[PDB]
Design a protein around this ligand. Structure first.
Ligand SMILES: CC(=O)N[C@@H](CCN(CC(=O)O)CC1CCCC1)C(=O)N[C@H](C)C(=O)NO
Ligand SMILES: [Zn+2]
Ligand SMILES: [Zn+2]
Lengths: 255, 255
């Protein structure tokens, strides 16, 4: 198989006699196929930065091993150079401390795996406008990816209502240094939707949210150049192409 | 405060001048807050069956009492009314003796309270699969709750490796009537994890186990309808929603 970096892929495996699915030592979780009682699914994602050329995954059964080979692909992401870089411009300590705490908090959440579906059907798009900045916009240096765009931005004037893309549990609902007013929902199975740069948060941590419920209002808060809604999906442990993911997910799960 | 039956809640209290926290007559133990040195914690659990509508706790300090009110919610559990062709006759006499003796042994263990932490940070789920039968699915013969599912079952084919959810000391590691092959671990502070219906046990009573370590193999043993791993948590003296509890626990104790 093949896969563009920063994308997720839904793997299908036989349910019967299945023990585990592994990428080296790291285990990869499995969930039931919705339309086929004899199958299970697993999500595999390639990081945007520094992917391997190739992945070999092993599905272990009672009676056999099934190898799965996945070649990384570069894709057609847009990319610009940078002309200066090295141990430069950090913030004040209590601000580094803020940056550090929030990273830790976020990583704890994205590491967590809720082993049931908190979603309800297909993902919807969080609002009905148009993309102004695509997933995977890179910035490069030493021919390496210095940074990339880890979600997709939708055009939004300040104050535009923003609806949960699917059902779930709110894990984050506060102001953060980079993302600004942030909401993050757990949908189950390590799948997380992200809504950043809001002007107003209308949910709180722990709250169960349904698909199409209002989570807040768009803004320009946090590290961003203007008002816009930033939409992200983390799955299989990584940030991946949100519209690509949604499209893959809904292929399997649409009710 | 509000709490759903069959859930645990972490109460935070001022450390200094604290003498005692009580629910009527019974004392509720307390342990240190892991981050904030000025605070202590307690765990309060409502039973699933026959909770009171309301609970009032007093925290006694040197110079004041402090009331904590907790109102029981019914929550949203699944529930199938029970046909009664006759809720009448029992199983044999040395078998009833088996049942009674094992119940007596388990209560001894669950009544204990080890006053220090045996865990090591956050809990993991004991394996990377999906839920096939949730906690709190009840069977309601007429108007009372006859029985309910006291843990959560994960899809597992017979032979699936099962890992300790946190570090601890093994208290039970043997075949019991209803649970089948059973491992139960003391994590400290009266928190116990449960692993039932196993096909093979790989630990001994009294053994020190580390989080992520192999405890045994999944199975179909005991009172269960097919292969599966059943995962439970006891805390505050009652069986509580184990994914909810894990999530609450990790929020405080994650390293
Ligand atoms: C990668 C990512 O998801 N970036 C986000 C927030 C940052 N944070 C992620 C999280 O905490 O979930 C991680 C930080 C990395 C180093 C320290 C913490 C963001 O605001 N992206 C750009 C600017 C944007 O949104 N353009 O529109
Ligand atoms: Zn963006
Ligand atoms: Zn069970």
């Amino acid at each position: 198989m093949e896969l563009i970096k920063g994308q997720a892929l839904f793997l299908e495996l036989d349910k019967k006699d299945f023990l585990s699915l592994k990428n080296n030592d790291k285990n990869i979780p499995t969930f039931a196929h919705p339309k086929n009682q004899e199958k299970i699914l697993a999500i595999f994602s390639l990081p945007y930065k520094n992917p391997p050329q190739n992945t070999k995954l092993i599905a272990f059964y009672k009676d056999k091993k099934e190898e799965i080979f996945i070649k990384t692909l570069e894709g057609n992401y847009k990319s610009e150079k940078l002309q200066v870089e090295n141990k430069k411009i950090f913030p004040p300590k209590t601000i580094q401390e803020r940056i550090a705490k929030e990273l830790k908090e976020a990583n704890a959440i994205y590491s967590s795996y809720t082993p049931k579906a908190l979603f309800n059907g297909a993902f919807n798009i969080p609002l009905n406008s148009f993309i102004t900045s695509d997933f995977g916009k890179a910035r490069t240096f030493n021919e390496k990816v210095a940074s990339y765009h880890s979600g997709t931005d939708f055009r939004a004037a300040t104050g535009t209502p923003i609806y949960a893309a699917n059902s779930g549990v709110v894990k984050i609902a506060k102001d953060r240094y980079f993302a600004g007013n942030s909401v993050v929902i757990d949908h189950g199975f390590g799948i997380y939707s992200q809504y950043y740069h809001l002007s107003k948060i209308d949910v709180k941590v722990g709250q169960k949210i349904k698909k199409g419920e209002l989570i807040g209002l768009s803004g320009a808060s946090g590290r961003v150049s203007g008002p816009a809604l930033h939409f992200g999906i983390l799955a299989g442990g990584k940030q991946v192409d949100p519209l690509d993911f949604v499209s893959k997910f809904n292929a399997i799960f649409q009710l």
